[PDB]
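A brief tutorial aside. Many learners find it easier to grasp structure tokens once they have seen a single protein encoded end to end. The record that follows does exactly this for Histone-arginine methyltransferase CARM1. Read the sequence first, then the structure, and try to relate runs of similar tokens to stretches of the chain.
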Amino acid sequence: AVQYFQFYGYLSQQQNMMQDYVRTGTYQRAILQNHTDFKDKIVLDVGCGSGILSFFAAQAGARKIYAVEASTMAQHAEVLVKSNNLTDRIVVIPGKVEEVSLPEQVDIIISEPMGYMLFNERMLESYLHAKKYLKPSGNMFPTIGDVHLAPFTDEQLYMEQFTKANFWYQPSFHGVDLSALRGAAVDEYFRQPVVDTFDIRILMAKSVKYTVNFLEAKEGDLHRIEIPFKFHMLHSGLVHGLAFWFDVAFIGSIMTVWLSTAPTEPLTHWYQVRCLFQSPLFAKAGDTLSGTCLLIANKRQSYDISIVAQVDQTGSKSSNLLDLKNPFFRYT
């Protein structure tokens, strides 16, 4: 009968642990397949995950690895380094990359691309700051980030927002009339990004792609990310919002490998979300839907998404503004 849960607390303790196993799993494979980018190289591992990528860098044959991390997590790493006999190969240095000091330049900077690296500008800044240690010939893991977006139709998803508000704000509430808050409540429900599994047949155009290259990214490039778009509509009907998916890649010398689950035919993205428009747009097949997404870092450690959209043939316009801090998982 359909339920909304906070995406960040949804999984059990075991499920969260199983999920770190699976994902670090795909990082190890990526590092091993590209062992040539690590063999006899100097590596800088930047913060969090308890140094585990450094162990993959070592497995792949790195000469020396600097692992930089906050002092609590650093002691656990220091324990792991010793008991795995890698004291000659991994140097754990407690602190922040900006105020810490390395005795040499590095060939590769690595960082574990969990959700809370990708949606937190503090983590991204540090990752970029670490390039001060990278040789001109150097590389980064991950190397690039893709955002894909596509419009979707989903009547049920959009009308649920009304049925939640109607249910709670129309009937009196222990003798108190709350109906004057109905509109404010609906407007707030529309600003809740939704994580879901949905069947691609609801997409109404081919996706548009936007690439961030971390290797070439300057100071402050990730504060504000402008994505203009023009979709050529393949289906007629109501566009209720935009669907987003996020992917990182390591462009090695051997093999470009995607690290949020990969493309060749239809399968599953670890990092996806749908954002509703406040008002749906009608488009004919063959029409164009254009506008812009702004992703801006906010005061609360994530990004706001601004989406503006227009049907060119008709002038019709809708928009929305959402915070990605607390997506909801929609369980069907």
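Self-check: The domain at 1-142 is CATH 3.40.50.150 (Rossmann fold). If you spotted this yourself, you are ready for the next section.
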